[PDB]
Ligand binder design. Structure first.
Ligand code: HEM
Ligand SMILES: N[C@@H](Cc1c[nH]c2ccccc12)C(=O)O
Ligand SMILES: N[C@@H](Cc1c[nH]c2ccccc12)C(=O)O
Ligand SMILES: [C-]#N
Length: 380
């Protein structure tokens, strides 16, 4: 939390991000706040084209810059894909592309919508006095009518917030290890285990608030990017800023720092091996914010928790360590059931070889590999 930008309450998410931008950027905000109206009519592309270029000099604080990144991101997805039928643009106008790339270079992120934009910085609460919950929360931006983006982004965000309770315990783990405190370390790991068990129960909410057929058909194509995607094979041309088409992967909770945090914390070597699964999870750290990228680096630059627990010859300590790994295996085993209900079954129903995700991976091969690596890390 010191320099890593991690909150006790909300976790990796942005605590109370801005809703309104400054008065200078009202032209972007009007396109963002009315994305379903402009895109359904079929008048979005002409409005983005007919819009004079603007500088990014008047964005003082950090919260404004990520709001503008979310705004510019949502328009860029909505411009490229459009109706979600097939008609797409290989080139983005220089009036929006240049300020977005300059803003992207400043925040050290790529010029595309990412998990940090559409989940972590895309929320408010209705009544500030009430706590964090779906009934007292709402998104800032949506793509279409009946896309279930409110239910989607908040249920993703609420599971991120569930893991916040575990992230604050990590300083206790490494303090207990270097000072040789068995009881502190055992209780700290069980707390992390219980917190990750609670995050799975928050996942269950997704069935209530997100419809499968709505999600797959309309929302999923807006979250999709242009890295190894048949529609934009060479990539997306950022006119003015760049020379050629540049490939950039779509949004995914692969870009969440929570997923990769507890694998690194528990010594689950996902990023090792150099396979197609390991190659993806390392690449997605460049799609995370710079502060959370440093946090994962910080956890890797610490003594191994796995090696410590194995050395001690302690049943209770291994058991507490396994509780964390079993919690990750449960979350991943449930996440596959979501993928079956929200991708596989919807994909078979639509009319006219392995399926590609929004991030670009062979999802069924990728997720089962990543879950398998987690399960092998169990002790006895
Ligand atoms: C309708 C809901 C969801 C669907 C359809 C879905 C689908 C997928 C797919 C296809 C991937 C593979 C990467 C890619 O996009 O190419 C993936 C990865 C991932 N998803 Fe989800 N997902 C959903 C919700 C969630 C939620 C709510 C979380 C966490 C709060 C989550 C965490 C992850 C993580 C961490 C990865 C990276 C691989 C891993 O660590 O297991 N997903 N997801
Ligand atoms: N990222 C999830 C926890 C998690 C870790 N690995 C996962 C794999 C799939 C789904 C979720 C997870 C959270 O915020 O609590
Ligand atoms: N990767 C998912 C989409 C997805 C799930 N959670 C996300 C969070 C942010 C951006 C995209 C997503 C898919 O292929 O269907
Ligand atoms: C989940 N992407």
């Amino acid at each position: 939390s010191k320099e890593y930008h991690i909150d006790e309450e909300v976790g990796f998410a942005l605590p109370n991000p801005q809703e309104n931008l400054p008065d200078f950027y009202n032209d972007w905000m009007f396109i963002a706040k009315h994305l379903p109206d402009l895109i359904e009519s079929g008048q979005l592309r002409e409005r983005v084209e007919k819009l004079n270029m603007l500088s990014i000099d008047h964005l003082t604080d950090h919260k404004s810059q990520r709001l503008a990144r979310l705004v510019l991101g949502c328009i860029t997805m909505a411009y490229v894909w459009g109706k979600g039928h097939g008609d797409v643009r290989k080139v983005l106008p220089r009036n929006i592309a240049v300020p977005y790339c300059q803003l992207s270079k400043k925040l050290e992120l790529p010029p595309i919508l990412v998990y940090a934009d559409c989940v972590l910085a895309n929320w408010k609460k209705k009544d500030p006095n009430k706590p964090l919950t779906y009934e007292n929360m709402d998104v800032l931006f949506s793509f279409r009518d009946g896309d279930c983006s409110k239910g989607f982004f908040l249920v993703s965000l609420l599971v991120e917030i569930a893991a916040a309770s575990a992230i604050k315990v990590i300083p206790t783990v490494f303090k207990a290890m270097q000072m040789q405190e068995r009881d502190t370390l055992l209780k700290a790991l069980l707390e992390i285990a219980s917190c990750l068990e609670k995050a799975l129960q928050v996942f269950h909410q997704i069935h209530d608030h997100v419809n499968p057929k709505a999600f797959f058909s309309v929302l999923r194509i807006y979250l999709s990017g242009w890295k190894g995607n048949p529609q934009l094979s060479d990539g997306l041309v950022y006119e003015g800023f760049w020379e050629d088409p540049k490939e950039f992967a779509g949004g995914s909770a692969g870009q969440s720092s929570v997923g990769q945090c507890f694998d690194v914390l528990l010594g689950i070597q996902q990023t090792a091996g150099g396979g197609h699964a390991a190659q993806f999870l390392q690449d997605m750290r460049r799609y995370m914010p710079p502060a959370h990228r440093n946090f994962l680096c910080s956890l890797e630059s610490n003594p191994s928790v796995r090696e410590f627990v194995l050395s001690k010859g302690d049943a209770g300590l291994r058991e507490a360590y396994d509780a964390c790994v079993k919690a990750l295996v449960s979350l991943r085993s449930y996440h596959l059931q979501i993928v079956t209900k929200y991708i596989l079954i919807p994909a078979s129903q639509q009319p006219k070889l392995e399926a590609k995700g929004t991030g670009g991976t062979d999802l069924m091969n990728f997720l089962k590999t990543v879950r398998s690596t987690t399960e092998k890390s169990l002790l006895k």
